[PDB]
Each structure stands twice: as C-alpha cells, then as structure tokens.
C-alpha cells in the first residue's frame, strides 16, 4: 500500500505570512481540517483546526502569521512511497501530518496517522 | 439479564461552557483541557455543542474573538437521561442519525457524554 | 436493519440424539461454527464449536447426544424482525445466538451477537 | 520519538500445551480457563496453535481424546522477539498474513502474544 492511495488530495496551501483569520476562511470554504504552510518553493510547516483554536487559546490575535502558530517541519515523503514508510516519517519527526509531493516536488496531498491506522485497519488470517 | 444503564457506560467529567462564553475564552479551555469540544450549557443544561471545526468556521466567517458560544455552537437539544437503558440512547442516537449524546439527569442537568462506542462495548460485556 | 439482512443463512440442523462426533463432522463439512438442534418440529437448542469443546473438557465422551451437552432454549425470531428486536430476546434469555425462522416456522438462519454488534457498526453524524 | 517495543504491548500469561498433550486435556485447559486457543509448545518454544476450531475439525475427522497436539494444531513457526520495534511485528503479519503472531524471548521461549489490534493501540499511543 502506497501513500498515494491513503493520503488526502490537496494542491492547496498557505504562505508563512498568511493571517489566521484568512487561512482559517479558505479551509471552510474548501472544508478542509489541515493545510500545508509554503515558503513559497517548499512546505515549511502545517496547520490544522487544533492549532488555530490552540493559537487563539494561547493568546495569539485573528491577524497572526501561519508561520507564528504553525507547526513548523520540513519533511516530505513521495506519493509512491509505502505507507509503513510515511510512518516512520512521522514517527522519527514527531508530526501527525506529512506534507507528500511528487517526483518533482510538487504539493500533491497531504496523509496524517489517521490514514495509517485506517490502511492498517484495511489489511489476514487468525 | 437486567438492561444495562446509561450512567455506567457513559464518560463522566466532561467539559462545558455556558451559552454566553467567549470565543477566545472556549478557545483557551479547549486549550488548556486539550480537549475538541466542550458542550454548551444554558444553566447546566446542554444546548449545543461546539468542536474545533465550529471555532475555525466562526472565524472564517469573520467572527470576533469575543462571539458568544451560543452565536456559533451547533445547535442541538437531544439528550439521554442516566437512567436510561443502554439501547434507549442507541434508539435516539439511530433516530438523530449521530454518534454522541449529551447525558442529563432528571432535572435536565449535564452528567456526562455516551457514545455508539461505549454501546457497543456495553453489548460486548454483557455478553 | 432487519434479522435476514444479518443472520448466516442456514437450514441445516441436528437432531437431539445426534452424537456429539457426527455433530462435529457436519459442522466440519459444511464449515459452520454453530447449529440448531432440533426436537423435530421445532429447536430445542444451539450446538457452537466451544459448547462442543466444553463437553469434551467437562469429561463427556464423543458419543454424548446434543442435548446433553446444547444449551437448552425454545425461544426464535422472524427474519422480518428489527435487530434491536433480536438483541432485547438474546439479553432477556440470556443466549448468544438465535435461530431465524420464517412465518411459517421453517429453520432459515442463525443471528447471533457478533452480528448484531456489526449492524451496529455498519450504522452517522458527531 | 522512540519506537515502542512488542514487549510492552503484547499478552503475556498466554496459555499453553505441550506437543504431546492429549487433545482431551487440552479441552479441559480452554474449558477451565474460558479461552479458544492455546498455544502449542516444544521445550517453551511455540510449534502452533490450536483453536476450539481445530478441535472440532479433529473430532469430525474422527481423531480420539489420545490425540496429541501436534497431530491436529494448526503448525506455526513465525514468531517474533519481544524485544522487537512494533512495526518489526507489522511487517511479519503483512508478509505472512495473519493478525496474531506468538512472541518469545532471546532464547525462543514463549512470552506472549501480539495481535494487529495491538500495534494499532501503540500507534494510537504515541501519537
């Protein structure tokens, strides 16, 4: 299994200067719970419902940057990649989320540990 | 056997806040308890529910921090007594087509959270 | 939902002086788990792969007849039947499985709780 | 973060019969300890299983209550070492199919089992 058959399609993203206030209006309108955070060429970040309620909770104003209470990350695993590999992603970086382009680069989706679980769940005798 | 109950099968502890509360002060307890979503009380009683999708909507519908809860909590009045037998809250929770019932007492005060889940387990251990 | 959506089809069943080994050998051929026992006209009794293995633990011999070692109930439902309506008799005769008959009274299946715990699974908002 | 280890998650206390046990004894184990299988040994160290199942089909084979274990147990040799990271158990089950695998120690003894529902917990766990 391939994370390419797991993972949540999604070319949309967000830049590092981003106000929360508008990021969280695009993923309502394209109902959405996680975003990837670009620096333009390359994921920096993620951020996902529980951190905007997180950022507010902390203090943080409606107007404050994606790259102030996103989770920031660099890592990124292929579409064609085993999902066992995306877990040990996960696992070695500490993220629930994984950024996952193509043989170019290219922001395709993005898979969480959820989808891990759920393939699992989908594969047996006793 | 005797039917299950409710009370012995539902979470307990659960987090509410009441019908006026801020958003941001939700935000912070959601936070703090590190918790999705907290019920919405109107003098203890449950009228809502409000999840971390709730709160990004709200703001991306341009609401303020201080938004009252009730403004944009999901509404929703269907609750289960704690006296009720196990299926009665699986007969509401088919009827309302949902996953999660508030639980009240006899005057209508919030107890606790029963879930299809904790249904099931509660077949599970009967049985 | 309804009882025939969720029993394992089945008319096949054992009389109440059937031998415990011929019993295993039915249910071997035909790869069941469980089966009705029968008083001719109507069920007397269910017969499951553990109560099979419980008489064998409990010292009786692989001659023993099914109504020696069944568990001895009369109660049966209609295919047409809610599962909510199969899972109040099961807990109020405290059984785990439950011959289906039609509305003549013919043997059509067995429901038990496994099947009802999946209908349940099978069926929602937050 | 680390990776958890089979040890801190499998079922220890399993039950066991050696391979020459009668399969009359073995009933009387599952009977008395209300399980469906036990695990079958030679010298501690894991040869198969046999489930309410196998017994079954060997009595309706025509097998007597003589019938030694390792004449009528589903034999199984894959195990995997407690020590072991989780998904080092994950990628046994893939490769060989199965949902519960017999876990020993250095030297081959039974410890334990581990099942898929397991690694999904410890999943769940550190995350």
């Given at each position: 299994?391939?994370?390419?058959?797991?993972?949540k399609?999604?070319?949309?993203?967000?830049?590092?200067?981003?106000?929360?206030?508008?990021?969280?209006?695009?993923?309502?309108?394209?109902n959405?719970?996680?975003?990837?955070?670009?620096d333009?060429?390359?994921?920096?970040?993620?951020?996902?419902?529980?951190?905007?309620?997180?950022?507010?909770?902390?203090?943080?104003?409606?107007?404050?940057?994606?790259?102030?209470?996103?989770?920031?990350?660099?890592?990124?695993?292929?579409?064609?990649?085993?999902?066992?590999?995306?877990?040990?992603?996960?696992?070695?970086?500490?993220?629930?989320?994984?950024?996952?382009?193509?043989?170019?680069?290219?922001?395709?989706?993005?898979?969480?540990?959820?989808?891990?679980?759920?393939?699992?769940?989908?594969?047996?005798?006793?």
């Amino acid at each position: 299994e391939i994370v390419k058959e797991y993972m949540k399609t999604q070319v949309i993203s967000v830049t590092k200067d981003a106000k929360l206030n508008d990021i969280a209006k695009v993923m309502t309108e394209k109902n959405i719970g996680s975003v990837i955070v670009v620096d333009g060429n390359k994921p920096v970040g993620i951020i996902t419902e529980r951190d905007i309620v997180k950022a507010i909770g902390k203090g943080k104003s409606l107007e404050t940057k994606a790259e102030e209470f996103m989770t920031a990350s660099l890592i990124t695993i292929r579409e064609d990649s085993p999902i066992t590999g995306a877990l040990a992603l996960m696992r070695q970086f500490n993220i629930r989320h994984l950024p996952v382009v193509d043989d170019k680069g290219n922001l395709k989706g993005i898979i969480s540990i959820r989808d891990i679980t759920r393939a699992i769940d989908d594969m047996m005798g006793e």
